[PDB]
Write a protein that binds this DNA or RNA. Structure first.
Ligand SMILES: [Mg+2]
Ligand SMILES: [Mg+2]
Ligand SMILES: [Mg+2]
Ligand SMILES: [Mg+2]
Length: 61
RNA sequence: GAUCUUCGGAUCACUUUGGUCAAAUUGAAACGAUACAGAGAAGAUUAGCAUGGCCCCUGCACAAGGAUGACACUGCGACAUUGAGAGAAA
């Protein structure tokens, strides 16, 4: 019962929008805060950078 | 005005104003009241040092504290294919 003491933990852990024009800008604003913070945490870290642009084109351009 | 001296005529003295309101709700601290939640290190209890800034208070302080003051990410990818089979479009 050695390999079964590990696999039994995984299966136990395994089992365990938007309206208006105004309310979207709130949603859109908070995601900007999110992104800007992750830049301050890491000056360089291009994953956070690249993402941030992609996200803005789809919304605005 | 004062001193010389023809009643003319001299001579001395020369442009202020430290103002964020011209009369205490609506133009210069926030804290406090209340409600919730209620304190790092992979059992539980537990000292700490750092680390990075668009977070800051105490401090004469390039001492030291403030919970170790508080807060803190980790998909992508510069895309090859092989060889076979099926499908739709030229
Ligand atoms: Mg300290
Ligand atoms: Mg402690
Ligand atoms: Mg202490
Ligand atoms: Mg620290």
């Amino acid at each position: 019962x050695x390999x079964x003491x590990x696999x039994x933990x995984x299966x136990x852990x395994x089992x365990x929008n938007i309206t208006d024009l105004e309310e979207l800008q709130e949603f859109q604003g908070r995601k900007r805060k999110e992104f800007e913070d992750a830049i301050r945490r890491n000056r360089l870290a291009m994953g956070h950078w690249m993402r941030y642009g992609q996200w803005e084109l789809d919304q605005k351009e």
